[PDB]
Amino acid sequence: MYFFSVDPRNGASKSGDVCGSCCCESISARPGEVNGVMVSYAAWSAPLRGHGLTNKTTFEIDGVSVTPPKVSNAFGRTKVGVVFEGTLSDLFPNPEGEQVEYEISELNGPSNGVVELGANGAFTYTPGALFTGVDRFWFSINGNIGEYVISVDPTTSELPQPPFTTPVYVPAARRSVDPRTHVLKFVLGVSPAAIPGDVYRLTVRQVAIDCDGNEFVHISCYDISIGSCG
Amino acid sequence: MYFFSVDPRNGAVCGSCCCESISARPGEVNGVMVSYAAWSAPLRGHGLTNKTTFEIDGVSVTPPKVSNAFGRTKVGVVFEGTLSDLFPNPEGEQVEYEISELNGPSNGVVELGANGAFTYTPGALFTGVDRFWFSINGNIGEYVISVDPTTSELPQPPFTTPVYVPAARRSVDPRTHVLKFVLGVSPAAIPGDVYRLTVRQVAIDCDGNEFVHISCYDISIGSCG
Amino acid sequence: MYFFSVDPRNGASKSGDVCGSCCCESISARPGEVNGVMVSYAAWSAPLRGHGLTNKTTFEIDGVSVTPPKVSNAFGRTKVGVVFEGTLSDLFPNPEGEQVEYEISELNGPSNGVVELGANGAFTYTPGALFTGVDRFWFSINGNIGEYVISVDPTTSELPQPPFTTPVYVPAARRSVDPRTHVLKFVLGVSPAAIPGDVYRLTVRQVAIDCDGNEFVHISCYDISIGSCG
Amino acid sequence: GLLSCINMPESCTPGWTFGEVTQLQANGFVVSGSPYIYNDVTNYLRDEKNRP
């Protein structure tokens, strides 16, 4: 659990470290992890005598480094109960000549079915019976990590298309704010497709409220450095 | 929350001329408290009054690159607009646009097209004003839309200035001689700019007369905190 | 019993990322042993005030130095009560010309039968009367260790085929977690055929749970070093 | 740092000139002018993101 204190901007009197301008706070993260972060606006909102904070926050994740992926992600559709088949060979455009070690990591396998990887870039996904939703699984073609999303339909018409989850993400509604202690809690998820060494930036906009219902906006920044022990 | 103390006028931080200092980040809305306790307490009277006057002047502006635009659509009806005739892109440069999710609309949703096109669907059962902040190749501007309640129209609001003080959010505590007010910074404020805010507060004696006092603060729009 | 304390993924760990280190933990193992490992997720799950861990742990075994075996394994079948015969010469493809000293270690012999090794690569296995299951025994052909599996049938049709247990493995269902003290226990089994000097890597993916039933993933890594004599 | 056994054929014009040298001296490289070695550095310019 990361725990950060906010710059209170009381007098903006914060002797910069002379050299060391960076004002965004560093956050290390590992591919696959899903960690929790708590930021304490108490230093900034406590002098502002009012009703504390409010849940009307906002976030944004602009990247800094990219290191574009090698393997592309893929999407498939099938009906309920019926077995699905798929390929894994046209998802890795290789510039050079080498072999293709198709592999499905057991840590990031399916969630509501089974996957039997064939001999050469083929696979059979048998979904769990009496089930209708979405499923994902992360393949590792020649070390490069990509994802495959499958949508199983309840045999009637069709299911919509998920947005192909990003490298670094913040869940939709898993955040919260405690106006009693001025503490904002949120989740930091790193998909297994993140490449080690990259750097992303997360900017948070938190609004406090006065005694009469007006707003006080505060903006902070964090540097998510994707590190990896492999 | 900024907290300043006024000089009690005895000839007793001059910086450059007199005025104090206030750092500020683009987009924030902070609060400032100034304590006239040092100046109004010896003048035993009825404390301060609610007759403050604020004035903003820019000593470093860096004239904006992109420009703003208005809008006067109706209720429930979708609105269409372009974002190409705003940036004059003097030297040949990619016109890559972007709608920051931190400063998106307030009662609707935009749909950034492929080439500076956007579709604003106002929230159903809503009539009023709305804004959003775009970033055309790093330079930030605002687009304002007025959704009208299908009768005739709606007036034109003023495009918000980079640094401002809200219309009615000031207060005075005569029991402690403290003035509270708010400092709002537009997201379009360019880092490095420097503005000057001047205040003219009036205290009052036990008979209903006035005592004037004038001060400044230099607001430095700085990036990264 | 091994005991590990997990990285709290807070911050100080590895000076954020500046350092990095995070070199996977060490586990010394001996061929034939079956040890127990415990990991304390408290330092990570205590700040996440919620319902502790869940029984959704996942493991993975991959070899970073394997030294492929010389002698191959073998599988045989027989019925209940009937004696079994077999040879032990066609399992040792020798590149050079040398002598074959067949041997059956009394430590890792059969469990429900008796084996009489022949004079020239032969063996007679009498299974235990009134028994039907699977049986294994580990031979040492010229020092090189291999396993022989026998399937005794309940005389009706046939028994399926076991998966030829790996050098290093984690038992199917012998793991547990105590949500009261944030401790995960599991077992680590090393086959008698594991060659000294080989190195495997075990990655553990453990998921905690918040106060509302959401998930928090954590991944850790260890190196199992197959050494001899401790 | 004078590489002894190279016996390079003496000439009157180098390869990398002053400019491109000064260029890839900021960028870490081991430019060699017999030929002697100087600026014996490694290709290290930046920690995780704070380049200097």
XYZ file of C-alpha atoms in Angstrom:
737
model
C 0.000 0.000 0.000
C 1.459 3.313 -1.109
C 0.889 6.202 1.301
C 1.480 9.762 0.111
C 1.104 13.166 1.725
C 0.018 16.076 -0.428
C 1.820 19.365 -0.832
C -0.468 21.626 1.239
C 0.216 24.856 -0.696
C -0.195 26.719 2.593
C 2.454 29.316 1.837
C 3.939 27.336 -1.046
C 6.942 27.597 1.211
C 8.611 24.317 0.414
C 12.334 24.813 0.047
C 12.941 23.056 -3.232
C 15.864 20.658 -3.045
C 17.650 23.211 -5.176
C 18.536 20.644 -7.763
C 15.774 18.064 -7.990
C 12.839 19.879 -9.542
C 10.624 16.804 -9.909
C 7.346 17.472 -8.076
C 5.486 14.347 -9.126
C 5.847 11.499 -6.659
C 7.406 8.209 -7.704
C 5.435 4.950 -7.719
C 7.020 1.595 -8.553
C 4.773 -1.081 -10.034
C 5.210 -4.617 -11.339
C 3.453 -6.196 -14.355
C 0.379 -8.022 -13.079
C 0.199 -6.422 -9.641
C -2.891 -4.594 -8.404
C -1.918 -2.342 -5.506
C -3.656 0.268 -3.380
C -2.736 3.917 -2.930
C -3.808 6.313 -0.177
C -3.214 10.064 -0.437
C -3.761 12.335 2.573
C -5.109 15.769 1.642
C -5.258 16.568 5.362
C -2.382 19.032 5.045
C -4.328 21.062 2.460
C -8.001 20.638 3.388
C -7.778 20.914 7.185
C -7.042 24.677 7.235
C -9.926 25.019 4.774
C -12.567 24.690 7.495
C -15.572 23.155 5.772
C -17.099 19.793 4.927
C -13.819 18.133 4.001
C -13.457 16.424 0.646
C -15.939 14.948 -1.820
C -15.993 11.921 -4.119
C -16.063 14.137 -7.268
C -12.452 13.447 -8.216
C -10.829 12.958 -11.616
C -7.795 11.096 -12.936
C -5.805 10.924 -16.145
C -2.980 8.668 -17.318
C -0.765 10.211 -19.991
C 2.243 8.116 -20.925
C 5.830 9.305 -21.094
C 7.698 6.308 -22.463
C 5.835 3.873 -24.703
C 8.096 1.115 -26.110
C 5.306 0.040 -28.493
C 4.271 -3.607 -28.178
C 5.427 -6.239 -30.636
C 2.431 -8.597 -30.549
C -1.040 -7.209 -31.175
C -4.107 -7.990 -29.092
C -7.084 -9.904 -30.434
C -10.857 -10.177 -30.078
C -13.253 -13.056 -30.688
C -16.925 -13.940 -30.417
C -18.848 -17.143 -29.742
C -22.185 -18.354 -28.420
C -22.937 -19.894 -25.031
C -21.914 -23.503 -24.474
C -20.402 -23.863 -27.940
C -16.656 -24.468 -28.122
C -14.530 -21.698 -29.644
C -11.445 -22.084 -31.831
C -8.766 -19.547 -32.646
C -5.322 -18.906 -34.059
C -2.283 -17.191 -32.580
C 0.040 -16.864 -35.599
C -1.132 -13.679 -37.348
C -0.830 -11.724 -34.074
C 2.992 -11.401 -34.234
C 4.303 -9.603 -37.322
C 7.985 -10.388 -37.154
C 10.515 -8.269 -39.094
C 13.231 -10.942 -38.872
C 13.233 -14.694 -39.350
C 13.057 -16.799 -36.198
C 10.794 -19.373 -34.614
C 7.617 -18.688 -32.716
C 7.317 -20.107 -29.191
C 3.602 -19.820 -28.514
C 2.936 -19.932 -24.784
C 0.031 -19.308 -22.412
C 1.125 -18.341 -18.914
C -0.724 -20.252 -16.210
C -0.813 -17.167 -13.969
C -2.911 -15.186 -16.472
C -5.030 -17.932 -18.001
C -8.767 -17.727 -18.647
C -11.355 -17.014 -15.952
C -14.509 -18.878 -17.034
C -13.193 -21.542 -19.387
C -10.250 -23.671 -20.453
C -7.692 -23.123 -23.216
C -5.886 -25.958 -25.009
C -3.000 -24.495 -26.999
C -2.339 -26.449 -30.187
C 0.992 -27.359 -31.716
C 1.512 -24.273 -33.916
C -0.318 -21.073 -32.988
C -3.718 -22.744 -32.715
C -5.872 -22.985 -29.615
C -9.274 -24.246 -28.514
C -11.149 -22.244 -25.870
C -13.913 -24.252 -24.212
C -15.989 -21.856 -22.082
C -17.586 -22.985 -18.858
C -21.118 -24.267 -19.319
C -24.035 -22.135 -18.094
C -22.158 -18.856 -18.448
C -22.497 -15.707 -20.554
C -20.043 -12.814 -20.378
C -16.495 -11.848 -21.357
C -13.200 -13.624 -20.789
C -9.541 -12.761 -21.288
C -6.237 -14.575 -21.481
C -2.693 -13.310 -21.958
C -0.429 -15.123 -24.411
C 3.371 -14.848 -24.588
C 4.601 -15.088 -28.187
C 8.419 -15.158 -28.206
C 8.460 -13.398 -24.848
C 6.196 -10.608 -26.096
C 2.982 -10.413 -24.073
C -0.384 -9.818 -25.712
C -4.000 -10.383 -24.772
C -6.972 -12.154 -26.326
C -10.524 -11.225 -25.318
C -13.456 -13.529 -26.090
C -17.147 -12.658 -25.802
C -19.663 -15.451 -25.196
C -23.279 -14.602 -26.027
C -26.502 -16.077 -24.529
C -27.407 -17.536 -27.958
C -29.892 -14.721 -28.677
C -28.176 -12.039 -30.760
C -24.723 -10.706 -29.893
C -22.554 -9.106 -27.159
C -20.791 -5.719 -27.299
C -17.034 -5.161 -27.488
C -14.847 -4.394 -24.436
C -12.291 -1.573 -24.684
C -9.100 -3.715 -24.675
C -7.727 -2.813 -21.236
C -4.682 -0.516 -21.246
C -1.120 -1.041 -19.899
C -1.679 1.066 -16.769
C -5.219 1.644 -15.544
C -7.274 2.842 -12.594
C -10.473 0.818 -11.998
C -13.753 2.544 -12.800
C -15.323 2.671 -9.320
C -12.979 1.409 -6.622
C -11.984 4.826 -5.228
C -13.324 6.444 -2.085
C -12.814 9.484 0.127
C -13.109 9.763 3.910
C -14.250 13.327 4.762
C -13.636 12.563 8.450
C -9.865 12.197 7.980
C -9.272 13.701 4.491
C -8.005 10.494 2.884
C -8.457 9.427 -0.740
C -8.109 5.733 -1.589
C -7.757 4.300 -5.077
C -6.433 1.246 -6.899
C -3.482 0.973 -9.296
C -3.654 -1.952 -11.725
C -0.856 -2.910 -14.109
C -1.816 -5.329 -16.864
C 0.655 -8.126 -17.696
C 1.227 -6.460 -21.088
C 3.270 -3.676 -19.480
C 6.868 -3.500 -20.703
C 9.633 -3.148 -18.081
C 11.438 0.180 -18.039
C 8.578 2.378 -19.242
C 7.255 5.437 -17.407
C 3.665 6.683 -17.237
C 2.207 9.750 -15.545
C -0.939 9.837 -13.414
C -2.492 13.231 -12.697
C -5.165 13.482 -9.997
C -7.668 16.327 -9.532
C -9.326 16.366 -6.102
C -11.983 18.894 -5.074
C -12.730 19.951 -1.506
C -15.856 21.820 -0.443
C -16.249 24.859 1.796
C -18.946 25.521 4.384
C -21.444 26.861 1.814
C -20.955 24.345 -1.004
C -18.310 25.940 -3.227
C -15.222 24.171 -4.555
C -11.465 24.163 -3.987
C -9.527 22.284 -6.664
C -6.146 20.619 -6.124
C -3.991 18.909 -8.757
C -1.139 16.467 -8.139
C 1.082 14.276 -10.294
C 2.780 10.907 -9.935
C 5.346 9.076 -12.057
C 4.521 5.378 -12.378
C 7.798 3.610 -13.168
C 7.033 0.111 -14.418
C 9.750 -2.047 -12.883
C 9.937 -5.797 -13.182
C 11.865 -8.695 -11.674
C 11.518 -10.250 -15.107
C -4.574 27.980 2.139
C -2.439 31.112 1.898
C -2.174 33.221 5.047
C -0.806 36.766 4.905
C -0.443 39.526 7.486
C -0.924 43.188 6.616
C 1.489 45.921 7.656
C -0.105 48.103 10.373
C 0.985 51.347 8.645
C 3.601 52.691 11.053
C 6.459 53.230 8.615
C 8.136 50.471 10.574
C 8.992 41.779 2.014
C 9.365 44.790 -0.259
C 10.540 42.436 -3.013
C 10.491 44.669 -6.083
C 8.067 47.449 -5.153
C 5.815 46.364 -2.292
C 3.623 43.546 -3.369
C 3.697 40.062 -1.824
C 4.124 36.700 -3.579
C 1.671 33.883 -4.391
C 2.593 30.797 -6.400
C -0.133 29.086 -8.413
C -0.553 26.010 -10.667
C -2.818 26.083 -13.755
C -6.273 24.683 -13.019
C -6.239 24.936 -9.227
C -8.751 26.878 -7.134
C -7.151 27.803 -3.814
C -8.075 29.956 -0.830
C -6.336 32.937 0.749
C -6.788 34.543 4.174
C -5.350 37.963 4.988
C -5.317 39.177 8.593
C -5.993 42.894 9.028
C -5.717 42.300 12.782
C -2.415 44.181 12.867
C -3.888 47.246 11.125
C -7.491 47.522 12.351
C -7.156 46.501 16.014
C -5.447 49.720 17.236
C -8.215 51.634 15.463
C -10.807 50.479 18.000
C -14.068 50.381 16.062
C -16.516 48.017 14.361
C -13.932 45.932 12.513
C -13.936 45.520 8.763
C -16.772 45.706 6.245
C -17.809 43.676 3.204
C -16.621 46.294 0.705
C -13.451 44.779 -0.713
C -12.431 45.467 -4.303
C -10.121 43.278 -6.381
C -8.233 44.112 -9.576
C -6.040 41.873 -11.737
C -3.169 43.146 -13.881
C -0.648 41.128 -15.870
C 3.018 42.085 -15.865
C 3.910 38.966 -17.879
C 1.213 37.490 -20.106
C 2.754 35.525 -23.019
C -0.171 36.187 -25.420
C -2.148 32.995 -26.057
C -1.540 30.909 -29.165
C -4.911 29.177 -29.579
C -8.181 31.127 -29.408
C -11.569 30.499 -27.815
C -15.035 30.035 -29.311
C -18.682 30.351 -28.277
C -21.827 28.271 -28.830
C -25.609 28.733 -28.592
C -27.275 25.344 -29.084
C -30.695 24.300 -27.782
C -31.898 21.808 -25.174
C -31.816 18.104 -25.966
C -30.535 18.712 -29.491
C -27.047 17.503 -30.356
C -24.384 20.063 -31.268
C -21.612 19.768 -33.849
C -18.442 21.812 -34.026
C -14.976 22.077 -35.506
C -11.588 22.623 -33.891
C -9.424 23.369 -36.949
C -10.064 27.099 -37.473
C -8.895 27.891 -33.921
C -5.161 27.166 -34.019
C -3.569 29.352 -36.743
C -0.681 26.761 -36.927
C 1.700 29.357 -38.427
C 4.608 27.046 -39.246
C 3.686 23.678 -40.758
C 2.910 21.432 -37.795
C 0.668 18.474 -36.991
C -2.725 19.663 -35.764
C -3.070 16.799 -33.256
C -5.965 17.707 -30.956
C -6.921 16.428 -27.509
C -9.710 16.820 -24.945
C -8.295 16.463 -21.437
C -10.508 14.299 -19.239
C -9.613 16.441 -16.217
C -11.349 19.478 -17.736
C -14.073 17.872 -19.827
C -17.684 19.034 -20.038
C -19.935 19.421 -16.993
C -23.377 18.239 -18.162
C -22.591 16.480 -21.427
C -20.112 14.396 -23.403
C -17.955 15.296 -26.395
C -16.892 13.052 -29.301
C -13.528 14.150 -30.688
C -13.565 13.292 -34.385
C -10.562 12.388 -36.483
C -9.804 15.945 -37.707
C -10.751 18.594 -35.149
C -14.424 17.632 -35.170
C -16.430 17.202 -31.996
C -20.029 16.300 -31.188
C -21.427 17.716 -27.940
C -24.513 15.929 -26.633
C -25.898 18.047 -23.772
C -27.425 16.284 -20.798
C -31.141 15.656 -21.199
C -33.325 18.083 -19.232
C -30.625 20.720 -18.794
C -30.491 24.399 -19.773
C -27.548 26.680 -19.064
C -23.835 27.141 -19.764
C -21.029 24.612 -20.136
C -17.311 24.732 -20.884
C -14.487 22.407 -21.795
C -10.742 22.752 -22.291
C -8.945 21.462 -25.378
C -5.198 21.186 -26.017
C -4.254 21.756 -29.658
C -0.662 20.472 -29.833
C 0.260 21.406 -26.273
C -1.391 24.846 -26.286
C -4.607 24.967 -24.263
C -7.818 26.844 -25.035
C -11.465 26.713 -24.008
C -14.751 26.150 -25.827
C -17.976 27.428 -24.249
C -21.456 26.198 -25.183
C -24.769 27.763 -24.157
C -27.700 25.335 -24.163
C -30.955 27.300 -24.486
C -34.345 26.285 -23.059
C -35.941 26.145 -26.543
C -37.840 29.415 -25.959
C -35.612 31.983 -27.639
C -31.969 32.144 -26.549
C -29.490 32.627 -23.671
C -27.079 35.530 -22.973
C -23.332 35.454 -23.579
C -21.058 34.913 -20.563
C -17.512 36.308 -20.448
C -14.613 34.042 -21.387
C -12.860 33.332 -18.098
C -9.542 35.102 -17.560
C -6.367 33.106 -16.750
C -6.277 34.332 -13.139
C -9.493 35.426 -11.452
C -11.204 35.911 -8.104
C -14.755 34.501 -7.922
C -17.671 36.927 -7.962
C -19.186 36.222 -4.521
C -16.981 34.032 -2.339
C -15.343 36.706 -0.140
C -15.996 37.136 3.563
C -14.849 39.231 6.516
C -14.712 38.279 10.208
C -15.032 41.512 12.242
C -14.360 39.618 15.485
C -10.887 38.619 14.243
C -10.241 41.031 11.323
C -9.717 38.303 8.726
C -10.606 38.507 5.033
C -11.206 35.219 3.206
C -11.279 34.966 -0.574
C -10.644 32.519 -3.399
C -8.006 32.445 -6.152
C -9.076 30.678 -9.341
C -6.549 29.856 -12.058
C -7.681 28.933 -15.549
C -6.131 25.799 -17.091
C -5.197 28.054 -20.032
C -2.736 30.026 -17.894
C 0.717 29.653 -19.442
C 3.497 28.763 -16.973
C 5.951 31.564 -16.321
C 3.313 34.289 -16.521
C 3.071 36.787 -13.661
C -0.068 38.718 -12.711
C -0.727 41.327 -10.029
C -3.754 41.430 -7.725
C -4.517 44.647 -5.863
C -6.912 44.868 -2.928
C -8.563 47.923 -1.327
C -10.110 47.016 2.025
C -12.111 49.499 4.104
C -12.376 49.381 7.897
C -14.909 51.424 9.885
C -14.866 53.371 13.150
C -17.555 53.504 15.827
C -19.258 56.438 14.045
C -19.597 55.035 10.518
C -16.585 56.600 8.789
C -14.018 54.762 6.661
C -10.349 53.757 6.723
C -8.839 52.657 3.407
C -5.960 50.224 2.889
C -4.327 49.055 -0.351
C -2.023 46.083 -1.011
C -0.843 43.774 -3.805
C 0.177 40.197 -4.386
C 2.104 38.896 -7.404
C 0.620 35.620 -8.618
C 3.236 33.506 -10.397
C 1.674 30.832 -12.604
C 4.182 28.002 -12.206
C 4.012 24.477 -13.591
C 4.642 21.271 -11.633
C 3.412 22.529 -8.270
C 10.576 -25.228 7.026
C 11.270 -22.127 4.961
C 9.798 -18.822 6.122
C 9.656 -15.744 3.896
C 8.528 -12.182 4.570
C 7.012 -10.557 1.508
C 7.838 -7.195 -0.018
C 5.253 -4.704 1.328
C 5.111 -2.956 -2.036
C 4.941 0.159 -0.004
C 7.781 2.369 -1.002
C 10.983 2.101 1.018
C 11.397 -1.324 -0.523
C 14.253 -0.965 -3.006
C 14.332 2.795 -2.408
C 11.215 2.952 -4.496
C 12.735 1.761 -7.735
C 15.983 3.687 -7.691
C 17.501 0.529 -6.328
C 15.347 -2.199 -7.807
C 17.207 -5.256 -6.536
C 14.222 -7.508 -5.828
C 16.423 -10.448 -6.803
C 14.190 -13.469 -6.289
C 14.490 -15.209 -2.945
C 16.634 -18.319 -2.496
C 15.455 -21.846 -1.685
C 17.978 -24.658 -1.282
C 16.569 -28.124 -1.920
C 17.803 -31.709 -1.943
C 16.603 -34.457 -4.315
C 14.075 -36.668 -2.540
C 13.109 -34.252 0.230
C 9.598 -32.883 0.721
C 9.753 -29.596 2.615
C 7.279 -26.932 3.696
C 7.299 -23.231 2.881
C 5.456 -20.384 4.593
C 5.113 -16.793 3.408
C 3.827 -13.923 5.548
C 1.795 -11.427 3.514
C 1.069 -9.386 6.652
C 3.535 -6.598 5.838
C 1.547 -6.126 2.617
C -2.029 -6.998 3.614
C -2.181 -5.352 7.047
C -2.407 -1.773 5.678
C -5.101 -2.992 3.277
C -7.628 -3.204 6.109
C -10.104 -5.816 4.909
C -10.838 -9.551 4.906
C -7.252 -10.702 4.426
C -6.294 -13.248 1.807
C -8.303 -15.749 -0.235
C -7.771 -19.348 -1.341
C -6.888 -18.330 -4.902
C -3.124 -18.792 -5.024
C -1.367 -19.776 -8.243
C 2.072 -21.262 -8.890
C 4.283 -21.859 -11.920
C 7.471 -23.869 -12.462
C 9.985 -23.073 -15.200
C 13.573 -24.258 -15.502
C 16.456 -21.837 -15.961
C 19.034 -24.653 -15.868
C 17.789 -28.192 -16.410
C 20.609 -30.491 -17.652
C 18.309 -32.916 -19.541
C 18.406 -36.471 -18.185
C 20.358 -39.351 -19.681
C 18.059 -42.250 -18.748
C 14.429 -42.058 -19.816
C 11.364 -42.962 -17.776
C 8.917 -45.776 -18.466
C 5.319 -46.805 -17.843
C 3.798 -50.270 -17.584
C 0.440 -51.867 -16.915
C -0.842 -55.031 -15.266
C -3.937 -56.430 -13.598
C -4.619 -57.080 -9.922
C -2.962 -60.148 -8.424
C -0.970 -61.018 -11.555
C 2.803 -60.617 -11.347
C 4.538 -58.061 -13.568
C 7.765 -58.447 -15.549
C 9.981 -55.852 -17.156
C 13.383 -54.984 -18.548
C 15.744 -52.175 -17.591
C 18.170 -51.955 -20.542
C 16.161 -50.124 -23.229
C 15.823 -47.057 -20.968
C 19.530 -46.098 -21.106
C 20.586 -44.948 -24.580
C 24.332 -44.731 -24.089
C 26.349 -42.675 -26.594
C 29.637 -44.258 -25.529
C 30.450 -47.891 -24.781
C 30.345 -48.691 -21.080
C 28.833 -51.069 -18.548
C 25.339 -50.805 -17.101
C 25.147 -51.135 -13.304
C 21.428 -51.479 -12.667
C 20.350 -50.612 -9.132
C 17.168 -49.976 -7.146
C 17.583 -47.709 -4.130
C 16.044 -49.203 -0.996
C 15.052 -45.685 0.085
C 12.849 -44.855 -2.924
C 11.503 -48.316 -3.703
C 7.902 -49.360 -4.312
C 5.052 -48.787 -1.858
C 2.549 -51.624 -2.444
C 4.719 -54.363 -3.907
C 8.079 -56.101 -4.025
C 10.682 -55.910 -6.796
C 13.380 -58.485 -7.549
C 15.982 -57.019 -9.889
C 17.320 -59.442 -12.473
C 20.971 -60.070 -13.191
C 20.886 -58.380 -16.627
C 18.513 -55.409 -16.682
C 15.435 -57.399 -15.667
C 12.971 -56.979 -12.823
C 9.959 -58.821 -11.420
C 7.360 -56.762 -9.547
C 4.829 -58.625 -7.425
C 2.074 -56.145 -6.473
C 0.460 -56.137 -3.063
C -2.472 -58.527 -2.845
C -5.919 -56.947 -2.470
C -4.777 -53.607 -3.867
C -5.514 -51.515 -6.953
C -3.907 -48.160 -7.724
C -0.596 -46.849 -9.056
C 2.961 -47.640 -8.007
C 6.381 -46.137 -8.687
C 9.984 -47.095 -8.119
C 13.216 -45.249 -8.826
C 16.110 -47.004 -10.549
C 19.735 -45.842 -10.770
C 21.209 -46.921 -14.110
C 24.948 -46.170 -13.932
C 24.282 -43.476 -11.352
C 21.703 -41.734 -13.531
C 18.328 -41.807 -11.773
C 14.989 -42.516 -13.420
C 11.502 -43.591 -12.414
C 9.359 -46.538 -13.504
C 5.576 -46.303 -13.123
C 3.243 -49.313 -12.940
C -0.553 -49.212 -13.176
C -2.446 -52.092 -11.554
C -6.026 -52.402 -12.763
C -9.098 -53.627 -10.858
C -9.221 -56.487 -13.411
C -12.183 -54.929 -15.209
C -10.917 -52.760 -18.101
C -7.994 -50.389 -17.478
C -6.559 -47.480 -15.449
C -5.534 -44.078 -16.876
C -1.944 -42.825 -17.118
C -0.257 -40.662 -14.444
C 1.599 -37.535 -15.588
C 5.181 -38.683 -14.801
C 5.910 -36.347 -11.878
C 8.445 -33.604 -12.585
C 11.789 -33.029 -10.806
C 10.358 -30.138 -8.782
C 6.635 -29.826 -8.118
C 4.061 -28.346 -5.758
C 1.374 -30.780 -4.525
C -2.076 -30.329 -6.042
C -4.054 -29.554 -2.863
C -1.800 -29.054 0.154
C -1.816 -25.236 0.297
C -3.644 -23.122 2.851
C -3.943 -19.548 4.086
C -4.786 -18.148 7.525
C -6.757 -14.884 7.084
C -6.196 -14.101 10.779
C -2.396 -13.765 10.604
C -1.869 -13.386 6.824
C 0.230 -16.501 6.244
C 0.231 -18.825 3.231
C 1.540 -22.377 3.647
C 2.427 -24.807 0.879
C 4.601 -27.847 0.223
C 7.638 -28.189 -2.046
C 8.491 -31.650 -3.382
C 11.755 -32.539 -5.120
C 11.924 -35.739 -7.145
C 14.824 -38.143 -6.499
C 15.801 -37.685 -10.166
C 16.585 -33.963 -9.896
C 20.197 -33.420 -10.957
C 22.352 -31.340 -8.576
C 23.305 -27.906 -9.839
C 20.055 -27.360 -11.735
C 18.079 -24.196 -10.994
C 14.312 -23.705 -11.278
C 12.173 -20.611 -10.729
C 8.868 -20.532 -8.844
C 6.533 -17.545 -9.160
C 3.674 -17.086 -6.686
C 0.569 -15.014 -7.457
C -1.472 -14.305 -4.324
C -4.688 -12.273 -4.262
C -5.954 -10.417 -1.194
C -9.476 -8.989 -0.812
C -10.826 -5.631 0.329
C -13.788 -4.882 2.586
C -16.269 -5.121 -0.314
C -14.981 -8.178 -2.188
C -12.663 -6.632 -4.783
C -9.200 -8.050 -5.472
C -5.564 -7.033 -5.004
C -2.937 -9.090 -6.825
C 0.673 -9.604 -5.750
C 3.436 -11.545 -7.513
C 6.698 -12.802 -6.009
C 9.585 -14.929 -7.244
C 11.937 -17.534 -5.813
C 14.816 -19.603 -7.180
C 14.901 -23.267 -6.183
C 18.527 -24.426 -6.353
C 18.720 -28.220 -6.524
C 21.851 -28.989 -4.519
C 23.281 -32.236 -3.194
C 23.986 -33.001 0.473
C 21.802 -30.244 1.891
C 45.511 4.588 -23.088
C 47.741 4.515 -26.160
C 46.660 1.303 -27.873
C 50.114 -0.121 -28.572
C 49.519 -2.780 -31.218
C 47.413 -0.965 -33.809
C 50.139 0.591 -35.998
C 47.444 2.562 -37.869
C 48.599 3.977 -41.233
C 49.484 7.617 -40.554
C 47.119 9.952 -42.383
C 46.137 13.620 -42.456
C 42.357 13.515 -41.894
C 40.392 11.900 -39.052
C 36.979 10.281 -39.144
C 34.689 11.928 -36.622
C 35.496 15.626 -36.826
C 35.365 18.011 -33.872
C 31.665 18.600 -34.242
C 30.369 15.090 -34.375
C 32.886 14.274 -31.612
C 31.715 16.988 -29.236
C 28.297 15.622 -30.210
C 28.842 12.032 -29.111
C 30.772 12.983 -26.000
C 27.637 14.333 -24.429
C 26.227 11.046 -25.685
C 28.430 8.473 -23.985
C 30.967 6.929 -26.356
C 34.648 6.032 -26.352
C 35.985 8.031 -29.342
C 39.531 7.097 -30.396
C 41.696 9.535 -32.336
C 49.065 3.885 -32.416
C 45.697 5.685 -31.998
C 45.159 6.741 -28.391
C 41.935 6.574 -26.383
C 40.220 9.374 -24.474
C 36.894 10.065 -22.695
C 36.818 6.461 -21.433
C 33.205 6.528 -20.308
C 30.315 4.087 -20.559
C 27.029 4.371 -22.440
C 25.310 5.670 -19.303
C 23.403 8.940 -19.577
C 20.230 8.755 -17.519
C 18.792 7.181 -14.397
C 15.225 5.992 -14.465
C 13.894 9.223 -15.951
C 15.812 12.181 -14.466
C 18.345 12.303 -17.343
C 21.107 14.458 -15.747
